[PDB]
Amino acid sequence: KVGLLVMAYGTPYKDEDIERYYTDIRHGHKPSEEMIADLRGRYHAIGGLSPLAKITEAQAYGLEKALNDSQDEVEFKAYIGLKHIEPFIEDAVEAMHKDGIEEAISIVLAPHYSSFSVEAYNKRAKEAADKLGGPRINAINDWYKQPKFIQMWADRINETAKQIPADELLDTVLIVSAHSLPEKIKQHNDPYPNQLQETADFIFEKVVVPHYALGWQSEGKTGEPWLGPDVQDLTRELYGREKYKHFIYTPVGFVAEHLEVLYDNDYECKVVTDEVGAAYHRPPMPNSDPEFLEVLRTVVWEKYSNL
Ligand SMILES: CC1=C(CCC(=O)O)c2cc3nc(cc4[nH]c(cc5[nH]c(cc1n2)c(C)c5CCC(=O)O)c(CCC(=O)O)c4C)C(CCC(=O)O)=C3C
Ligand SMILES: [Fe+2]
Ligand SMILES: [Mg+2]
């Protein structure tokens, strides 16, 4: 049996979890009352709580099922390890150890690598395994280059574009985004920004949308520059420069419908298109669609074959 360590950010299970969840996100530094209320307000705006918890489970166990049905070389056992709420990464690794799992494959539910994201996932998983003495953790760093992943997104964009009048397709633009990070990672050649540009390039060559731009979103409450431009600011510039009639947002850095999509895209971005008078489009996120499980199954299996 090979452990499948599936890792993701995590989301509060109950409204009462928001406080400790934000504290964990802030590296154990309690947010102010005013920050807590702002974040609580955003959750209420998207309906109360994020569906990320159930989607993540569906992805993790959909992947496990997908792998075990497609071959009989090994039995995969999925453990869920969350970054900022239980079950934590270290909990999942502990669960594998007590279960006797000797070798595991880990994957992050975000297709691009960065020092701030996947690297932190792998560091904590590998350090937990070290302390316990097992299991051996073979980390997958990124998988945006998976052809089925690029094609999944192209199909979703093409499905939306084919409902845009032909005489307005030329005024349609594809906005490809991911979670922003401190700009300083670009000073040491972090692959994150360039992996995102590669993703947008690969998708653009497979869609009927004639225009596209790369943006970032959800930058944090800090004092340093973050990767820009922000998807809101980019929408304004693009409309002012080209008067686009349709904006299609694909935050390909994310794999599920959660706060950073339901609010930062479906509210904040729609507010900008509403303002300039253009139409807002946001294709469904991967979630646990069969096509996406197939993407993850292909990635994990290729990683196992290379082991
Ligand atoms: C790179 C990256 C991803 C993508 C890769 C991955 O998936 O790992 C990601 C995902 C997510 N980030 C999420 C939520 C939040 N992230 C925050 C804050 C931050 N994220 C950061 C980084 C990332 N985050 C950073 C550097 C900060 C600043 C911390 C600080 O200020 O020191 C804050 C604080 C409040 C605010 O700043 O708005 C919240 C609430 C949720 C869950 C949404 C839900 O609950 O549905 C998801 C999926
Ligand atoms: Fe975050
Ligand atoms: Mg904001």
Side-chain angles (χ1 to χ4, degrees), residues 9-12 21-22 25-26 39 42-43 50 52 110 117 121 179 181 220 226 254 258-260:
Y9 208 77
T11 197
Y21 175 72
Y22 205 169
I25 287 178
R26 300 232 100 204
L39 175 55
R42 281 182 267 149
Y43 278 113
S50 190
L52 186 62
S117 66
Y121 283 98
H179 195 299
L181 285 179
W226 283 58
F254 300 125
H258 47 58
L259 185 68
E260 316 299 65

Side-chain angles (χ1 to χ4, degrees), residues 22 26 31-40 42 221:
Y22 205 169
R26 300 232 100 204
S32 73
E33 316 89 79
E34 297 101 299
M35 304 149 110
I36 300 176
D38 187 282
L39 175 55
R40 182 159 271 130
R42 281 182 267 149
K221 196 177 172 311

